[PDB]
Design a binder for this molecule. Structure first.
Ligand SMILES: */C(=C\C(=O)OCC)[C@H](C[C@@H]1CCNC1=O)NC(=O)[C@H](CC=C(C)C)CC(=O)[C@@H](NC(=O)c1cc(C)on1)C(C)C
Ligand SMILES: */C(=C\C(=O)OCC)[C@H](C[C@@H]1CCNC1=O)NC(=O)[C@H](CC=C(C)C)CC(=O)[C@@H](NC(=O)c1cc(C)on1)C(C)C
Lengths: 302, 302
């Protein structure tokens, strides 16, 4: 079976806390003696399209922030703003702080999101950073501050923090340094996701997965040139395939014995002839939220 | 957005341990002073279709089992068999034992699976118990002993423990009392999943989700009688809808303002006219692994 798989969320669950100002409550990430939070937690019903966070923050003091690590309360003994996040220092170092680091991920990469509310984790699922810098998340009211992450052996690489929902229902956020992924800003102005694209690299990885899985109905005897493939990719709103992408697919190509431009050839057929009522792994859609790394991780065997 | 969402896995991750006999290693669940394990961990290359677990176990002693809670080692000071599981008593009570209980779930219900290897959790995803008593999991070698579960407030309800892969690639296992879900047994005899069925109740819940989500292209002005619907359900290999199923859908029906047999009427149209190149929530398939409870949990708002 091939399922969208999220990383075990324990190491992240222990870092989720609640942060509150006025009647505004959202989630924060508690690492060591710091708690990170979308800075919009300091906005008020008035300014939502003209928030001067600079101005709004200087009018705040440490006791202006209530931080709850569950039943317990943490004391804010210092604060600062970093890009679109607030870094709150507290008099207690989270005892469950895992080994971790901050990474700014690239479009096409995937990560696990731990959807949280009032500082309480409620669900975890896998996402991909869309070429248009948004993510197809599942978030309800009270979800900002929820984080995205990957776990390699013991390091929790934090990638993302949730900040907002766009008009199409997709989500935008920042890395843990507070810089937004994409041309978005944390203010209620009316902004919109740019047009998105299908992630070519991932679909191909997926096809390799399908074959490693034992399916190969879509394969054919043809081959294509990178450039000829990109002419079709453009017609079907797929990202242009590059030599770097072909190289990344080397391991998989080897393991299955199917050359990359061959697998491409198959993909160009799929895109032209449709799936004609057939399925791959279990889908009727060309799945693009599985990276080459995700496929090796999950099909590491016969 | 509407995503297959797994429960936060932390409370379960802390109970995963490794258990070994001979050259056979698989995962076990460590609650208090007990560790549960598929009993097949005691088989040998010889008997795989004629294993007499009774006989195989009496020939075993406590030191016959090495249990590793990560770096640490636990000492087996007593053992017993319960149906298809072994209950290993150890001289240490797991300090991370969460509030929990054992539940035997019914077909159509969903749960989260924490895929584990050598006692180390590697991924979590949501599954449903298929009407045919198998699950469409994603398991590689070394995955038996991985558990399925649900979390309500603080209680981790353990449902499932993985034991085997069937010929079609689907999985079979037992509840935590060691009784298999389905007519399967823990021996290499050649068995096969019975024919499966689509879970009608869940699809309907999903449609309600789609509407709560803002989509409603599939709705129509028609209505149907339970019996008339079941005549179509049978042609399309769907489970017969019952009055109990209609009642369970009450809350959702109310919230959306669409009567159950009306929503049915829409479903019978979908099944007859196909989706004609359209999508629901994001699928081109009528999704049946979301229960009414899953939909309320995830669309609890506007
Ligand atoms: C999370 C807010 C929170 O957790 O605290 C309150 C309890 C939230 C994310 C949302 C909630 C529903 N689903 C989500 O993903 N973020 C926001 O509500 C931001 C807050 C912004 C400031 C500066 C206070 C606001 C929005 O997301 C709003 N939309 C837009 O700003 C927008 C409009 C256009 C056009 O492009 N972007 C709405 C409330 C959705
Ligand atoms: C997990 C075994 C384990 O963790 O320990 C060894 C390191 C495993 C589940 C598999 C692995 C691949 N994907 C999975 O889900 N369970 C088994 O291998 C059982 C063990 C059985 C006994 C009594 C020792 C065996 C099987 O699943 C085998 N198939 C069948 O038994 C079968 C054939 C037919 C027909 O119907 N059922 C194969 C190894 C798949």
């Amino acid at each position: 079976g091939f399922r969208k798989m999220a990383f075990p969320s324990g190491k992240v669950e222990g870092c989720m806390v609640q942060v509150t100002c006025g009647t505004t409550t959202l989630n924060g990430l508690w690492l060591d003696d710091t708690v990170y939070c979308p800075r919009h937690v300091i906005c008020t019903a008035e300014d939502m399209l003209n928030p001067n966070y600079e101005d709004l923050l200087i009018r705040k003091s440490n006791h202006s922030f209530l931080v709850q690590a569950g039943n317990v309360q943490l004391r804010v003994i210092g604060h600062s703003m970093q890009n679109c996040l607030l870094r709150l220092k507290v008099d207690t170092s989270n005892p469950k702080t895992p080994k971790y680091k901050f990474v700014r991920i690239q479009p096409g990469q995937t990560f696990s999101v731990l959807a949280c509310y009032n500082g309480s984790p409620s669900g975890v699922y896998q996402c991909a950073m869309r070429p248009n810098h948004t993510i197809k998340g599942s978030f309800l009211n009270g979800s900002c501050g929820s984080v995205g992450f990957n776990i390699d052996y013991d390091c929790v690489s934090f990638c993302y923090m949730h900040h907002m929902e766009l008009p199409t229902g997709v989500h935008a956020g920042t890395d843990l340094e507070g810089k937004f992924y994409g041309p978005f800003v944390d203010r209620q102005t009316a902004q919109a996701a740019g047009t998105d694209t299908t992630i070519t690299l991932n679909v191909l990885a997926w096809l390799y997965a399908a074959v490693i899985n034992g399916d190969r109905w879509f394969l054919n005897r043809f081959t294509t040139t990178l450039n000829d493939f990109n002419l079709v990719a453009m017609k079907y709103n797929y990202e242009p395939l590059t030599q770097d992408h072909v190289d990344i697919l080397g391991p998989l190509s080897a393991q299955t014995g199917i050359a990359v431009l061959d697998m491409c050839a198959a993909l160009k057929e799929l895109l032209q002839n449709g799936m004609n009522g057939r399925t791959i792994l279990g889908s009727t859609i060309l799945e693009d939220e599985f990276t080459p790394f995700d496929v090796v991780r999950q099909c590491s065997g016969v």
